[PDB]
Each structure stands twice: as C-alpha cells, then as structure tokens.
C-alpha cells in the first residue's frame, strides 16, 4: 500500500517478456496486482504484476520493451507501490493501436 | 679489458683491507678507546669499494658493500647516511638482485618516514611499485604501493601527481576485470580536469575511456552515461568519440557486428589503437 524501495531486474523468460507484465516474486506481490513504479518525482508508471519464482526477492523484472518505454536499467533503484484501478472510470472500453513491424 | 681484472683485484684488496681494519677496530677500542674514527674510516673504505665495484660492472658486490656500509653506519647512530647507503644499495641491487633491492628500499622508506619525510617515502614506494609491475606480474603489490604513494602525495597537497597514479591504478584494475573502481577513478579525474584550461583538452579522452569502461556492464547504463557526459561536458559532443560510441551502440542494437568491426577498423586506420582499448573492444565484441 504505502510503497517500498525495490531493485530493477531482467525479465526471466520470453513468455513473460511477451506478456508485457512485470515479473515479481511471490514473497513480494501476487499475479494480477497493479503497481505504480516511481523513478523520479515526475515519472510514475503503472504495471500489472505476474509471479515467477526465479525473480530474486527485492527485485522486479521488466521486459526489454518496458525498459525502453520507461527507461529502466538492470540494478536501478525504483519505488514500487501496489495500485488499484478505478474501474468506475479507468476501465478500457475502446483503445487504438498503431501496429508496426518489430523485426524489420 | 684491463678494467674488469684490475678493478676486481683492487676492489678485493681494498675490501680485505677494510675487513682487517674493522677486525682490529675492536681491539683498538678495547685497549685504547679510539672512539668512532676507525669505524668512519672503515665505512669510507667500504663506500670506495662499492664505488669501484659499480664501475667494475659487478653490481652484486657494490650492492653488498653498500649494505654493509649502511649497517655499520647505522650502528654509529647516523640514520641519515645509513638511509642514503640503503637507497644506494636498493638502486644498485635493483637489476642484480631485485628482492634485495626491495628490502633495501623498504628499510630506506622506514627510516625516512620515521622522520616524516613523506615525499622520499612516496618516491621509494613508486619505485617499488614500478619494479613490481615491470618485473613481476604481482599486480596487487603494485596497486598497493601506488595507492600508498598517491595518499602520501595527497597529504602533501601535491596535485597533478596523485592523479597519474590513480589513473594507472584504475587502468590496471579495469584490466583486472573490476570496472566500478575504474569508472569512479576516471570520472573523478575527469571532473577534476574540466576546470583546468590546459588539461581540459585531454579531459574528453578520460570521459571517452570511462564511457567505454561502463560499456561492459550493460548497454542501458552505457547509453545513460553517454547522455550524462554529453550534457555535463557539452564540448565533449564535438569530439569524434561521441560519434564512434553512437555508431557502436547502433551496431550492437541490431546485432550488426559487421558494422561494428568496420567502424573499429576505419578508426584504427585513421589512428593506430592501443592494447588496452583493443582488448576492451574485443571483449565487448564477444557479446
């Protein structure tokens, strides 16, 4: 709830890398829980958690696209606080995607 | 030629005469209490023998004579001349008997630092580190002596000399596969050198090396450090080093090793590369 300081880690497996969800250890969080990751006062990003045992305690694993979007690095310090979406207004009813080729 | 045989014979005769003189000095002191004049005369003869041996190219004999003179004059409560003879022995045995020179220089360091003469102790420490690195592969001893000398010079507020020792230590450490120390030392030297008009021009080089040293850790921190260096030292952006790092990072981003090696070869053709940079680039290229 309050939020705790945590370590940045690398995505353990390709499946979770493609899942676009931060991989966390069960001892810290649980799959499906949303989180807000703070890297600075003006930089907060919302993730959804999925559990994988291989993640070392005290660290959160992110996929390469996540690290590129949020500018996260291996070994970097972050603040992780569990987050709850306001489903009364934050539910997704429509969404637009610009689809490109990942591999040229 | 005549030098070899003549010097050997005359030095042997003089050393034997000095040995007989010191042998009879005990009897002279016991029977008459002549004082220390005989010991000083014997020390003079021993120093002369050491000088002749040095001219005779017999370094071992000259070093041994210097050691004997140092011991005998230290027995006379004259620590300054004893330390002088010990340093002479260290710089004479340096080539003949490196270990003997090592202990002689250590004794000279002890005697000098007893008086607080930190500059001479630091110079002797630098000499010991240089000998260790040049002759032996015991990197740790060289690093320890270099760090001690740098601390000694920092305590003397003699800047521009500790910086080079720290840079050497950082480079050798990076060669030893420890990069955090190398990154920190290079960054510290660079930030100390920016404000200097004269050294500012070289500062960029330091920055470049540091950025390369951080390349092995991970690509993301390498890009971040490139950004930080570009923003903190804008002049660095003008140098070709930024373009080279950007091209290398672009080549790595797509596993385009061929472009990486083409760029490295072109830069080498423009200017020949150093062993350290070559090894660092080759080790990076393994990935």
From Swiss-Prot, chain A:
Subcellular localization, as worded in the UniProt entry: Cytoplasm
Subunit description: Homohexamer. Interacts with GABARAP and GABARAPL2. Interacts with GRIA2. Interacts with PLK2, leading to disrupt the interaction with GRIA2. Interacts with MUSK; may regulate MUSK endocytosis and activity. Interacts with CDK16.
Family indicated by similarity: Belongs to the AAA ATPase family.
Role noted for this protein: Required for vesicle-mediated transport. Catalyzes the fusion of transport vesicles within the Golgi cisternae. Is also required for transport from the endoplasmic reticulum to the Golgi stack. Seems to function as a fusion protein required for the delivery of cargo proteins to all compartments of the Golgi stack independent of vesicle origin. Interaction with AMPAR subunit GRIA2 leads to influence GRIA2 membrane cycling.
Protein name from the UniProt record: Vesicle-fusing ATPase
Protein species of origin: Cricetulus griseus (Chinese hamster)
Lineage of the species this protein comes from: Eukaryota, Metazoa, Chordata, Craniata, Vertebrata
UniProtKB/Swiss-Prot annotation, chain B:
Keywords for this protein: Acetylation, Cell membrane, ER-Golgi transport, Membrane, Phosphoprotein, Protein transport, Transport
This protein's GO CC annotations: glutamatergic synapse; neuromuscular junction; postsynapse; presynapse; presynaptic active zone membrane; synaptobrevin 2-SNAP-25-syntaxin-1a complex; terminal bouton
Gene3D superfamilies: Tetratricopeptide repeat domain (1.25.40.10)
Annotated GO MF terms: protein-containing complex binding; SNARE binding; soluble NSF attachment protein activity; syntaxin binding
Modified residues (Phosphoserine): 27, 30, 196
GO terms (BP aspect): apical protein localization; brain development; intracellular protein transport; membrane fusion; neuron differentiation; positive regulation of ATP-dependent activity; protein-containing complex disassembly; regulation of synaptic vesicle priming
Cellular location(s): Cell membrane
SUPFAM superfamilies: TPR-like
Keyword Protein transport appears in the UniProt entry: yes
N-acetylmethionine PTM positions: 2
Membrane topology: Peripheral membrane protein
Stretch forming the signal peptide: none
A matching Pfam family: SNAP
Role summary: Required for vesicular transport between the endoplasmic reticulum and the Golgi apparatus. Together with GNA12 promotes CDH5 localization to plasma membrane.
Similarity annotation: Belongs to the SNAP family.
Subunit structure: Interacts with PRKCABP, and disrupts the interaction between GRIA2 and PRKCABP, leading to the internalization of GRIA2. Found in a complex with VAMP8. Component of a SNARE-like complex that contains at least ZW10, USE1L, RINT1, STX18 and NAPA/SNAP-alpha. Interacts with VTI1A. Interacts with STX12. Interacts with GNA12 (via N-terminus); the interaction promotes CDH5 localization to plasma membrane.
Protein name: Alpha-soluble NSF attachment protein
Organism expressing this protein natively: Rattus norvegicus
Name of encoding gene: Napa
